[PDB]
Amino acid sequence: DEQQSQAVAPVYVGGFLARYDQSPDEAELLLPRDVVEHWLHALPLNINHDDTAVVGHVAAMQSVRDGLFCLGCVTSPRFLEIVRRASEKSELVSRGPVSPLQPDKVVEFLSGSYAGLSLSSFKQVALCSVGRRRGTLAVYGRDPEWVTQRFPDLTAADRDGLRAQWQRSTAVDGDPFRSDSYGLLGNSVDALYIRERLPKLRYDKQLVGVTERESYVKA
């Protein structure tokens, strides 16, 4: 029960929502630095843009040298419990993370299922199987500092900005989740047919240098 308790503790997620160095083929995905900074100077967090699947909120957004970076917090008790039960029936999760890391079923299931970040119009951030913008790898962890530290691009100045924010009671969060296991299950088949999902995910991890660090990323 104590272990199950830790499992459903808050989960932080960080990663780039846009990479200023990546030029998308699709115009609708354009997101220039000047545009980001203009609107920049809490948004809800959901599953694949489904309004009935809100699992938490965004705690920080920082426009940095290489793109727009954000840090969210998965808090929904219902969502986390669903994820906990599913994680116990995953062969991938059973195999665990890279050596030094402590096994963390919930974090690992999230890292595998929703490895991408998606910003939509700012209005909301979605956790998805893989983002349409490149370099949008989602990094999960129990500590905000730890998550921010998985990204080699961020400097101490960058993290200070991010920290000031997440360290600074959201309108989005009782439990905002209005879906269920069946909903997540239905969405999982959609994720199985996204073309070049893994190649894109591997390209993303290498781009943001998470490969040079130890993390729960499964790609």
Place this chain on the structure above:
Amino acid sequence: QAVAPVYVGGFLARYDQSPDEAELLLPRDVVEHWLALPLNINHDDTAVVGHVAAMQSVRDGLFCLGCVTSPRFLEIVRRASEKSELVSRGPVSPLQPDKVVEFLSGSYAGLSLSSRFKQVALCSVGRRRGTLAVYGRDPEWVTQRFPDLTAADRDGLRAQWQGDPFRSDSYGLLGNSVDALYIRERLPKLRYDKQLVGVTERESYVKA
């Protein structure tokens, strides 16, 4: 009714296919020699969804036809299917929408025979090539999806296929879903299988 029985058919093995590994070798003589089997999800004994009612060794391999009958499993699938964007898009032109059949076709596109033949598993993709799973509401229609089968092959199968054992849940199926996302070359394999058995998305519910 979405929760009515769903039939599934396909080859459990293709005799002209030399498996990458050496433990997946299943020659014709061994098959015909040994030649109901429970049908489960990804070989999990707590996930029995029905049974295999027919098996026939044909020219190109071992073909089977099973039936998904578990009310619990079918209901779980029905609820998930209503929340799938892929399923909402429906099938190709002729075929009519069938959410449950489409979810199954998308999630468990492969067949897997495992022995110590003791059971057939519906899986995201089979380890043996050419094991594409074809789902439909009528077993005749299912077999007609495979060009390699002759009328004589069908006659033999027809005669064979012509309380809830599921002890799992949506959570278990969801856990299995994340594993499927990391099977390497999954879509290419399914496409290769589809090619090998002559089935097209244009005449079935296959999603790959």
